[PDB]
Design a protein around this ligand. Structure first.
Ligand SMILES: Cc1cc2nc3c(=O)[nH]c(=O)nc-3n(C[C@H](O)[C@H](O)[C@H](O)COP(=O)(O)O)c2cc1C
Ligand SMILES: Cc1cc2nc3c(=O)[nH]c(=O)nc-3n(C[C@H](O)[C@H](O)[C@H](O)COP(=O)(O)O)c2cc1C
Ligand SMILES: [Ca+2]
Ligand SMILES: [Ca+2]
Ligand SMILES: [Cl-]
Ligand SMILES: [Cl-]
Ligand SMILES: [Cl-]
Ligand SMILES: [Cl-]
Ligand SMILES: [Cl-]
Ligand SMILES: [Cl-]
Lengths: 341, 337
């Protein structure tokens, strides 16, 4: 059984260094009955690989960690190929920058144009769809799956007051900083941010990442606390606080929409509960609020704190002792408004 | 001078192709226009270059040509022509089997087909920007006056509790498909789906289009509920719609780890709140006074009082529910028992 892979990447690199890739590739691909082509053009690599499923996969894992390229995207995988596309070529390297033949110029220009455009579109794609494509899965074909998820929601305290008083550029700087911190920490704990909705960050963890979701939440709150006293009191970042809600439930995860517009969405009750628990933190002495189901997913010896039943009928709300606000929330929102007067 | 590159989907023969090339060569010679037309696996690629007012004069006619569909202009740029000798060189890349070109041909095909998939996930604003020759990654966020639209599915948690997953997915896809088609038909821009919610925007000149979008959606769902049998889950599909108006910052937001087109501002939150509020109203549509002020048509506006500082909520008479929402939510659950 044989498969064929095509990927693109960003060149990180001397002309003689690329020759060394060709040299080694030809040797290894001959031994392993792998065939294919490597092209390069205006700082991008294009490679097609084909051969026995297992030898191709071992090579691709190796290519994934090669530091001579970054931002690798496997565009297409074919699983039960009958013929090789390049049966004579262990690894043929083609420098398309070198080809100035007039009849190849249109195709060369179009490949560069469409691939650069493709690379821009990738930046707006959701991580989960990027993952599916990388795994050889048709996002337009795969069925959504019911999965057990911890939903994470966070947003900026008194964000309407920030947007009312601050210039547009300052708001953007602040929001970008907030999104950067949240995204880096969520991703470091193995979570996936799903969307930004206004100033809100929506993310998800698996049922085995209960403690990681609490740690992520506590780490975000901690980094904002550091940031607020790192900056001068006139920097808008001095005013940046967050609240976080977590929920746990069955959600349907997948690609939804029509041929006119697709998106990657999570469907289910847990989404709205986590959002509502996020909003509830504004009137709690804790910056983090979550459901009994989230507590059930935790293994670590947190000092859980029962905050009673709250209408979202009414459910129990929990937090942990580390999430206690060192401040009174209403005074902070008034202080935020006075600072920008 | 100007140079355009676009792609397009061929809409369902050699001598018809030849007519495009023959007639293009004549006009492009007349207009001093040069370029190349490539086709491959049902896709057109074309590059056009020439004096500014000459090429876009021809691109407007290419746009409304019936022989291709889903036209995306990928690039707009000029000192020197790229194809000075070709009024229009047509290249059928399907019927070239030369061995050294099949690598480039296969990459062109795979990346373009992949590009067409990614296009479907983009914010409408980004697709609009690319089409207008502007790279969306380098636009700085701008404060714009927008009408924000939120719609979601009534009693959706009951539907998700009772229906098989695949039936939920068919139902949500139908809903999204209806909302997206109509929003886009009225010139609105869908920005994202969030759970079962559709988020979209309209400009301040589109107050009446925003209300008409909302009523068309409600009206199509009402048609659909009696088109299908009472055992089809689409028999149970209702929406509520919230609209707000305000200053919002639109643009790229995030970091290298995750970036996205976002809308920031109170109007976003207000529209979602008013969408949720329709549950407790005799009307499936609620909007602010600012949306009302954006409307030129003689709607029968109905003032529904202030709601939590409080804000005034309006609707139109045509948005009145013929049902009572509590009974309907109970009916949905009972039906699914
Ligand atoms: C763009 C690119 C393409 C590559 N293609 C191949 C290839 O086709 N076959 C191969 O053996 N190595 C390829 N390599 C390099 C391998 O990842 C790796 O550096 C080396 O070949 C294996 O080292 P090893 O002999 O210790 O296993 C490629 C590297 C880059 C950057
Ligand atoms: C893919 C495609 C590419 C085309 N390219 C050109 C072109 O480059 N120049 C041109 O005059 N017409 C081109 N046409 C055809 C125009 O849409 C239209 O048929 C033509 O301009 C008719 O000219 P007329 O105003 O004399 O009727 C193209 C059509 C298609 C479907
Ligand atoms: Ca906020
Ligand atoms: Ca809903
Ligand atoms: Cl930081
Ligand atoms: Cl701990
Ligand atoms: Cl604790
Ligand atoms: Cl947004
Ligand atoms: Cl009217
Ligand atoms: Cl009316």
């Amino acid at each position: 059984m044989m498969k064929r892979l095509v990927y693109i990447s960003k060149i990180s690199l001397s002309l003689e260094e690329i020759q060394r890739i060709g040299k080694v590739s030809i040797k290894n691909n001959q031994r392993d009955n792998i065939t294919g082509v490597l092209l390069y053009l205006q700082g991008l690599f294009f490679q097609i690989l084909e051969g026995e499923n297992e030898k191709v996969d071992k090579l691709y894992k190796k290519i994934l960690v090669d530091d001579r390229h970054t931002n690798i995207l496997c565009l297409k995988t074919e699983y039960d190929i009958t013929d090789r596309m390049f049966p004579n070529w262990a690894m043929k390297t083609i420098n398309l920058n070198e080809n100035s033949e007039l009849m190849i110029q249109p195709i060369k220009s179009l490949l560069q144009t469409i691939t650069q455009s493709h690379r821009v579109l990738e930046k707006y794609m959701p991580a989960r769809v990027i993952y599916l494509i990388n795994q050889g899965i048709n996002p337009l074909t795969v069925e959504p799956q019911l999965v057990e998820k911890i939903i994470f929601f966070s947003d900026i305290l008194a964000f309407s007051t920030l947007t009312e008083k601050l210039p547009v550029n300052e708001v953007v700087i602040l929001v970008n900083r907030y999104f950067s911190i949240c995204t880096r920490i969520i991703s470091a704990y193995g979570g996936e941010v799903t969307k930004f909705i206004g100033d809100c960050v929506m993310a998800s963890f698996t049922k085995e990442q209960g403690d990681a979701a609490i740690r992520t939440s506590l780490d975000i709150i901690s980094e904002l606390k550091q940031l607020r006293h790192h900056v001068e009191a006139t920097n808008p970042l001095h005013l940046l606080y967050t609240g976080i809600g977590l929920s746990y439930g069955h959600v349907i995860e997948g690609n939804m929409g029509s041929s006119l517009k697709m998106d990657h969405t999570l469907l289910g009750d847990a989404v709205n509960v986590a959002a509502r628990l996020e909003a509830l933190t504004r009137q709690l002495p804790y910056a983090l609020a979550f459901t009994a189901g989230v507590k059930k997913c935790c293994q670590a010896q947190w000092t859980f704190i029962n905050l009673g039943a709250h209408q979202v009928e009414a459910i129990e709300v929990y937090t942990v002792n580390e999430a206690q606000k060192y401040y009174d929330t209403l005074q902070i929102t008034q202080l935020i408004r006075q600072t920008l007067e």
